[PDB]
Chains A and B, each alone.
Chain A
Amino acid sequence: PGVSVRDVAAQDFINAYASFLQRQGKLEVPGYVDIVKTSSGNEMPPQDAEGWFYKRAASVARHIYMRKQVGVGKLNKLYGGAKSRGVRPYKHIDASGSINRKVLQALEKIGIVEISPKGGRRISENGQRDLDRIAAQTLEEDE
């Protein structure tokens, strides 16, 4: 019927597509991974250390599929949280800029996302061709 990325739950599609990333093994992971903690407001680095670039990449892939175009400044706001400022009240603090810009560069290499007119990154037709195909694959799992 033409199943798409919108027709499947956000959690399991991101998990399934990230596992597609771990098997494909072609992502150009940065090298400072497992030393960084990916937000200035965060307190620890990602507990699931051996992935989580693949998790982040799958997460960012769905976002450009939904929206028109994003930049890296938008993604830091999305992935930021409340920073416990000790004895002071909490505050929204943006995420680590390098993490978003590099995985956006990394997704350019595999050909999922492309540059856009009017600024930002846009899902390419290669991106709009395989994200549906995992979405077909991941939604028959319970059927």
Chain B
Amino acid sequence: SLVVQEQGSFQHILRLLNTNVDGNIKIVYALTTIKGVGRRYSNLVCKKADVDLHKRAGELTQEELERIVQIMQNPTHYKIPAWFLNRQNDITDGKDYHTLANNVESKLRDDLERLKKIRAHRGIRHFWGLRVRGQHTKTTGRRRA
């Protein structure tokens, strides 16, 4: 029914959160390239930003994607129910975070460093590089490295 002439503003690449998001796919699946946001979360932000989810990533207006990234970086202030965030009730701050792109990688290294610094069992298992969730290791993960 609805055929639409796309115009010359279109982008094959776009940059949000320091990552080269590819165009030419639907916006919710496209933003999952950015670390710290997966398919569930990505749907909710674009829902809370009141954007047409049917659009491709490369054709969306300049104000809309900056509106999107604000809702990602201040989630619970814009009525996200906050058990939906990944790093809620944090160990020092007490408040619900949601690390994005580099925070996810950097903050994951840091809480590892506590368990290594207090010599907790899980930390010592990470320092050896072995499993930490209680798996059997007599056969599996044999050629891990």
Contact = CB atoms under 8 A, between A and B. Distances in A.
B131 interface: no
Interface stretch (B14-22, B39-47, B61-69, B104-112): B39-47
Given A34-B47, A35-B44, A49-B47, A44 B39 contact: yes
A37 to B, nearest CB: 8
Contacts of B47: 34, 49
Interface residues of B, number: 9
A73 interface: no
Contacts of B53: 49
B44 to A, nearest CB: 7
B39 A35 contact: no
B67 to A, nearest CB: 17
Interface in B9-55: 39-40, 43-44, 47, 53
B81 interface: yes
B84 interface: yes
Nearest to A34: B47
A45 interface: yes
Contacts of A49: 47, 53
B43 A45 contact: yes
Interface in A7-59: 32, 34-35, 37, 44-45, 49
A32 B83 CA distance: 13
A42 B10 CA distance: 35
A83 to B, nearest CB: 16
- Which 3 A-B pairs give the minimum distances between C-beta atoms? A34-B47, A35-B81, A35-B44
15 contacts: A32-B81, A34-B44, A34-B47, A35-B44, A35-B80, A35-B81, A35-B84, A37-B40, A44-B39, A44-B40, A44-B43, A45-B40, A45-B43, A49-B47, A49-B53
Interface of B: 39-40, 43-44, 47, 53, 80-81, 84
